[PDB]
Amino acid sequence: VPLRARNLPPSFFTEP
Amino acid sequence: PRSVASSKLWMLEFSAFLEQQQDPDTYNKHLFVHIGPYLEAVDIRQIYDKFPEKKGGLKDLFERGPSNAFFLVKFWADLNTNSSFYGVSSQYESPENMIITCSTKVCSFGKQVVEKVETEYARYENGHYSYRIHRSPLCEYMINFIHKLKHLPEKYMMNSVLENFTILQVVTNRDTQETLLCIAYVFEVSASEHGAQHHIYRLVK
Asked: Which CATH architecture has domain B1-205?
């Protein structure tokens, strides 16, 4: 499953 | 609190770097990744396939516990860099004196390609017990992987590679084989004007 399509918090793809 | 700490071991600092010798007394150090409100939770079965499934594997380690020792670290690595040393320095603290073993498994498409062990004895410090892995040389796989990434001309191409590249770090009590800390590492390329960034997550079911 694409990393962006997996059940992970939105912050995973949002760099601080 | 927001620390990479189990019940027995706490990782205060972690950092991968390239140190270049400009002249006999000058050294430039570039930090690729570094650590040092509350921790967001992550379903371990979301990353399970990205790591090797076997006895000693991530699923096998999580299921054996302690569940308070599992973390997932999302890193945005700083790749803006140009004699050379590639190294990893980590610092752990424990309330108890132990002989720890830190095993690092580099994985490509979920299968382990490289592995290195370090064993550290406690140094008593002000009532605390310190374990400092000072300048552990980065393996040839990683140095050649950092090199290949830099050859791609756009960061989208670089991140695409890192969507099938992970690292698993298992710090273990050598004598008792207890999992002290188990950190899963995933990467992206940093676009931040403030250097390498990171997000720590607690791994749960």
From this structure: Distorted Sandwich (2.70)
Identify whether the C-beta of residue B185 lies closer than 8 Å to the C-beta of residue B168: yes
**Torsion angle of the four alpha carbons B32, B145, B18, A3, in this order, in degrees rounded to the nearest 10:** 10
End-to-end alpha-carbon separation of chain B, Å? 20
**Experimental technique used?**
X-ray
Contact A15 B43 (CB under 8 A): no
Distance CA B143, CA B154 (A): 20
Phi, psi of B148 (to 5 degrees): -65, -40
Resolution (A): 2.5
A10 to chain B, any CB pair closer than 8 A? The answer is no
The verdict on A16 touching B (C-beta cutoff 8 Å) is: yes
Q: Do B188 and A8 touch (CB under 8 A)?
A: no
